[PDB]
Amino acid sequence: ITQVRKEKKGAGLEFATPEEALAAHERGEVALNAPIKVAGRETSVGRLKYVFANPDEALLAVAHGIVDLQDVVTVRYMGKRLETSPGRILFARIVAEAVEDEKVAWELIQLDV
């Protein structure tokens, strides 16, 4: 659940605005998790296309088949805008609920591996 997808279809195409990127992905020219570049900064289609206000929403989307736990995406968690998978958010919440402390749990885990 904590491993993230690395996809070869987009493979570092250059884009001006995220709308163009979303369009390219829409046509099927760029994979969701492919490492592209928009506005000179390296990102992915998934991070732009799906932006979740909170974990509950992201996991709700995973439940509806919108995205997969391994898809890299944008989730807003603890006042921070995070680029990560819903699965890593899930792990974070597992540790968090298990120890009944959100802050300490957030400190203990390594989210990015």
């Binding site: 799906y50 932006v51 979740f52 929403e57 439940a63 509806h64 805008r81």
Partner: protein
């Protein structure tokens, strides 16, 4: 061979309108997950709710633009608009449009939205945006009734050219968890203990959610009646 046993007792633990725990024991072997899974599916997908499906902001072209005079970007505002919990007082009402106009130094909350007939805002203290000196925010939000989760590209609704479509989070139910533990009644050792855990936004209580969920299921069972 002979089998006769008592109907299970339904146990309820509720904290506020946000959360509840539901225990059903004893159940025959396997029935813990037989009840639990469909209910979880129904509770997440089919429970009637409200959501913000569209947003228009003055002088704003696309979603990834920014707002001069405001620190939050358009993205961050839309996120807060997803956390907005709106309750419709009347069953007839399908869709509403909520207008918000404010300026000067201010911290805009959900309460600032101009009231509409038979529309209740459950979370008025929810923070939409902060405005600076010279900061101007004029926006209209489209609120619809629906079920489950619809991404922005799927409904794709626009009242005008600059309207930004928002991922529609309809489900009043935020999370459903269930676990089956082995329990024993007398000499029957394989019996099931069903525990359900439901998180909602308060618009619909967990008990209300579960009740609506089991009703949907029963009604679907009546579909095997007349060929």
């Amino acid at each position: 061979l002979d089998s006769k046993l008592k109907a299970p007792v339904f146990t309820v633990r509720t904290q506020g309108r946000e959360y509840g725990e539901f225990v059903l024991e004893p159940l025959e072997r396997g029935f813990g997950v037989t009840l639990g899974n469909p209910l979880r599916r129904i509770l997440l997908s089919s429970i009637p709710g409200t959501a913000v499906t569209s947003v228009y902001i003055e002088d704003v072209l696309h979603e990834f633009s920014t707002i001069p005079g405001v620190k939050e970007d358009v993205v961050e505002i839309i996120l807060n608009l997803k956390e907005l919990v709106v309750r419709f007082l009347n069953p007839s009402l399908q869709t509403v449009t909520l207008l918000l106009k404010a300026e000067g130094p201010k911290e805009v909350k959900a309460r600032d939205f101009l009231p509409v007939a038979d529309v209740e805002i459950m979370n008025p203290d929810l923070h939409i945006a902060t405005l600076e000196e010279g900061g101007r925010l004029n926006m209209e939000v489209r609120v619809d009734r629906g079920v489950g989760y619809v991404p922005a590209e799927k409904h794709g609704i626009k009242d005008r050219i600059n309207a930004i479509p928002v991922d529609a989070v309809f489900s009043p139910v935020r999370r459903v968890a269930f676990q089956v533990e082995d329990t024993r009644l007398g000499q029957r050792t394989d019996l099931d203990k069903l525990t359900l855990r439901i998180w909602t936004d308060g618009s619909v209580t967990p008990l209300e959610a579960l009740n609506q969920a089991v009703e949907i299921l029963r009604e679907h069972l009546t579909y095997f009646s007349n060929p």
